[PDB]
Structures are given as structure tokens and as C-alpha cells.
Design a binder for this molecule. Structure first.
Ligand code: NI
Length: 341
């Protein structure tokens, strides 16, 4: 049964609610982005209207085979009427095709659902500037002050410089990058660009990347592993065993692996600067864990919410424990008292 924080009152709408069968009263199912916790339940057998971005639509059609007749893509930054209700989709600064949704309810209330997002000051100059929001359904993944991490630009800077240095010292080194979902594509694209290489990958990951509307993509990626000195592998293989096994397959072309594991936040953030990060090393294999986040830091979240000044907040992450829900409510009340709304 569909939980309350996935229902939009005063409408026939749900958000990211595909794992509960037919939801009573739902005339339109919104999908914020193509991550499995959110799409859980869709397939070629689905027969209700799905509303989403163009990119998310490409992935539904090609990767899950949803029929064309049930896919409704909407452009961003554009006022659209759906089942007689005005909606707008906004870029969420999460993974490719991810959106936030603004709903303009027939009674006058305005609701923002963030989906998954990484708050940014540029959002303060979207169509959000122009009117008041009564309810915010908020991505609270990192809603606690311990959750600190650097900008995406600093993380990419560290990775480019690390890879370029290593391969210039040893032209026979291979770079490997872990992946398990869409998002974070800048990590492997930036490293391959500086090395003058295409990125090599499986047929299945190549198919996924072809759905993303990335400019000039055919110039950037390939299924021919032999021509490439940046390879992608499933995240589960990014360990000493998996990487040894991969180096064997390359036919004595390479004699060293340097690998990157993009994670979310980890506790080594509480002591160490991005500059000071060191790898795990066994022999000719080194593994770097780098904190490339596609969710708001606590400081970014707080800045956005204090700017938006919503009348009510409904968290969508960490909602399963009393302690979690209580903690998040305390922070919302500080932020409100500090800013005066
Ligand atoms: Ni996500």
C-alpha cells in the first residue's frame, strides 16, 4: 500500500509510486528520475500514464520496454496542463533526466516535490522565484550537520590530476571507474578526455548511455575495450580480486591499474580534505574512493529551504525511525526560527 508522502492531495497524482500495484484514485503516475528505488515496479506490462522528462522516457522505453503509448515526456521550465492541473518540471541537479515537480492545485495551494536533488543557488533564479510554496516534499538524504563533502568541480579536479599524473609516469597503466546506476558520468568522462581516450564499456552500459542526450556522445564512448585506456566496470568488481581478474583479460597490454569508486558520503569526510585522500594499494593495483555526491550537503539544503520559506515540510528520506523523524523536525524548526518565517 502506497505511503502518504507519495500522494499529492487534491489531485489524482502520485510520485515515484510504482511498487504498490494499482493505486486507488491515481489517474497519472509521475516518475522523478531513473533510479531503481524510485522506478521499482515498472515494466512492458504497465498500462497507466507515466509523466516524466524526455531522458527518463528514453530509459523507460529502451531499458524497461514500457510501451510508447503510456510514456508522456514533458519539457522543462514550461507550464503544462495534466488532467486539468498546471505542472512544471525543473532540473533537480541529480542524475541525467532527474526533475523536481511544481504542482499548482485547483484550490490555490502550490506544492514542490524535489525528487532527489542537489540544491544549488542557481535554483533561486528558476521559475521558483515568482511565487509562494505552501508544501515542500524534501530529499532529506543528508539532513544532519556531519554530512559535509566538497563541490563536484573540486572532486573532478582531484580525479583528472590523479589520473593524468599516473598515466604520464606510466604509459602502461589502465584507469578503471565503477558504476551501478546512471549519475556521476562526469567522473569517467573527464578522466577520459584528459587522457585522449574514449571510455570502454559493456554493451548493456553503452545502451544506457545512448539514452541520455549527452552532446557528441558517439565521440566519447565505445564497446571496443582494446582501443580504450579508461574502462567502466560494475561497482561490485572494484576490489583487488575483481581488478586482478580484469587485468588478466587485457592480454599483457597493461601492468598497473588505477581505479576510482565514486561513493556518497563516508566518515573519512569528518577528518580529511579532498587534497589529502589516499588510496588502498595492493601491488600494481590502487583504488581511490572519491566523495562525488548528487544529493545536497546539510549546508546546501539549509540554504535552499531558508530561501524558499515553505509553510510545511514533508521529508521523503530517512522516514523509517522515530529518532530520524524527530531529528529532522528539530532542524526544520531551528532553520525557521533563525530566518524568521
Ligand atoms: Ni536518486
Amino acid at each position: 500500500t502506497c505511503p502518504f508522502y507519495k500522494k499529492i492531495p487534491g489531485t489524482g497524482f502520485t510520485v515515484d509510486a510504482f511498487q504498490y500495484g494499482v493505486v486507488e484514485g491515481c489517474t497519472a503516475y509521475f516518475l522523478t528520475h531513473f533510479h531503481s528505488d524510485h522506478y521499482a515496479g515498472l515494466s512492458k506490462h504497465f498500462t497507466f500514464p507515466v509523466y516524466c522528462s524526455e531522458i527518463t522516457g528514453n530509459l523507460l522505453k529502451n531499458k524497461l520496454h514500457v510501451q510508447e503509448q503510456y510514456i508522456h515526456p514533458l519539457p522543462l521550465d514550461t507550464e503544462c496542463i495534466v488532467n486539468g492541473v498546471k505542472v512544471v518540471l525543473l532540473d533537480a541537479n541529480h542524475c541525467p533526466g532527474a526533475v523536481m515537480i511544481l504542482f499548482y492545485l485547483p484550490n490555490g495551494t502550490v506544492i514542490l516535490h524535489t525528487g532527489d536533488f542537489r540544491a544549488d543557488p542557481s535554483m533561486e533564479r528558476s521559475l521558483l522565484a515568482d511565487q509562494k510554496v505552501h508544501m515542500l516534499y524534501l530529499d532529506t538524504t543528508y539532513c544532519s550537520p556531519e554530512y559535509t563533502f566538497p563541490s563536484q568541480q573540486e572532486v573532478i579536479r582531484f580525479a583528472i590530476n590523479t589520473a593524468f599524473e599516473a598515466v604520464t609516469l606510466n604509459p602502461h597503466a589502465l584507469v578503471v571507474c565503477g558504476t551501478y546506476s546512471i549519475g556521476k558520468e562526469k567522473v569517467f568522462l573527464a578522466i577520459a578526455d584528459v587522457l585522449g581516450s574514449k571510455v570502454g564499456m559493456s554493451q548493456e552500459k553503452y545502451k544506457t548511455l545512448q539514452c541520455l542526450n549527452i552532446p557528441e556522445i558517439n565521440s566519447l564512448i565505445t564497446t571496443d575495450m582494446c582501443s580504450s585506456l579508461v574502462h567502466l566496470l560494475p561497482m561490485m568488481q572494484i576490489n583487488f580480486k575483481g581488478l586482478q581478474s580484469h587485468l588478466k583479460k587485457c592480454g599483457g597490454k597493461y601492468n598497473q591499474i588505477l581505479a576510482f569508486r565514486p561513493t556518497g558520503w563516508t566518515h573519512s569526510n569528518k577528518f580529511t580534505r579532498i587534497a589529502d585522500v589516499i588510496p588502498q594499494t595492493k601491488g600494481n593495483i590502487s583504488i581511490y574512493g572519491i566523495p562525488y555526491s548528487e544529493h545536497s550537503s546539510y549546508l546546501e539544503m539549509k540554504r535552499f529551504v531558508q530561501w524558499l520559506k515553505p509553510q510545511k515540510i514533508i521529508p521523503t528520506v530517512n522516514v523509517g525511525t522515530w529518532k530520524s523523524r524527530s531529528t529532522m523536525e528539530k532542524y526544520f524548526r531551528e532553520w525557521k526560527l533563525e530566518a524568521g518565517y
